[PDB]
């Protein structure tokens, strides 16, 4: 199947409390493999997946200073964007950056992306074609003009369809044992009377990987969005994920509601029904 590499960065100004907190995290698919935390004792890019630990001290020496550079850029940008938005020097603000690339089963480039946010809102993003930028508002258009000047899009394209796609392809082999696996969802339903005449049907999916999944409830074959409680997909903490969906039903009609589970490791869509005798 398809694979991805992604880096997430967060920079949080702490006015009068020293430099901004800086936390970086790298993933392959839904598996974390590196991290950097400005407040952590190490002050180095640390490994976080077994198969990346073999990388030599040159790898960790590079990554440490590069990820620190990105941190210093976010340190200036916090001040610049403060000006663009005419904000005081007393408030805490947040820059967030996400970038990476996607490949197919054969290791060929599919997609590159970069997106930036300020205080949790869209700021500027690189377009799908990797040539042009979309700024979210008029302040971010100032940056878009700076970056169109200095041809950042072309230097960045270098990484997103070049360096990125090659190192993804290495990692995917250094860790071929753990990363190529797909675990399909163990499924089952539960039933909880809320009273004498209504009950909660809860459709569970556990132990799956990757985290993408779909749960849907059908009443006589029709999709009920009524009384449908869906939780966020969550990590088991072992590399797998969990999700559930629930619908409140009239007691004695449990047979007419059916739950549907779609996942990549599933040869056909699972269909589950509460089976009263």
């Amino acid at each position: 199947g398809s694979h991805s590499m992604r880096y997430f960065f967060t920079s949080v100004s702490r006015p009068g409390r020293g430099e901004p907190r800086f936390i970086a995290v790298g993933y392959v698919d839904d598996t974390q493999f590196v991290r950097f935390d400005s407040d952590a004792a190490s002050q180095r890019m640390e490994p976080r997946a077994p198969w990346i630990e073999q990388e030599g001290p040159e790898y960790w020496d590079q990554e440490t200073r590069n990820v620190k550079a990105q941190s210093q850029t976010d340190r200036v940008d916090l001040g610049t964007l403060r000006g663009y938005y005419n904000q005081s020097e007393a408030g805490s603000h947040t820059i967030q950056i996400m970038y990476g690339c996607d490949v197919g089963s054969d290791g060929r480039f599919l997609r590159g992306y970069r997106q930036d946010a300020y205080d949790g809102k869209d700021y500027i993003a690189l377009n799908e074609d990797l040539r042009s930028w979309t700024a979210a508002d008029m302040a971010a258009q100032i940056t878009k003009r700076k970056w169109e000047a200095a041809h950042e899009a072309e230097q960045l394209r270098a990484y997103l369809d070049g360096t990125c796609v090659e190192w993804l392809r290495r990692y995917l082999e250094n860790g071929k044992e753990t990363l190529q696996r797909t675990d399909p969802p163990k499924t089952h339903m539960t039933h909880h009377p809320i009273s004498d005449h209504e009950a909660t049907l809860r459709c569970w999916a556990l132990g799956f990987y990757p985290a993408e999944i779909t749960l849907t409830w059908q009443r006589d074959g029709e999709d009920t969005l009524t009384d449908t409680e869906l939780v966020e997909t969550r990590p088991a903490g072992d590399g797998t994920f969990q999700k559930w969906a629930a619908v409140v039903v009239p007691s004695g009609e449990e047979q007419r509601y059916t739950c549907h589970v779609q996942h990549e490791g599933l040869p056909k869509p699972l269909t589950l029904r509460w089976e009263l005798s």
Binding site: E63, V67, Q70, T73, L81, I124
Partner: peptide, 10 residues
């Protein structure tokens, strides 16, 4: 690997 080329600011 992260980006190597240090960017220009915002």
């Amino acid at each position: 690997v992260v980006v190597g080329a240090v960017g220009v600011g915002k």
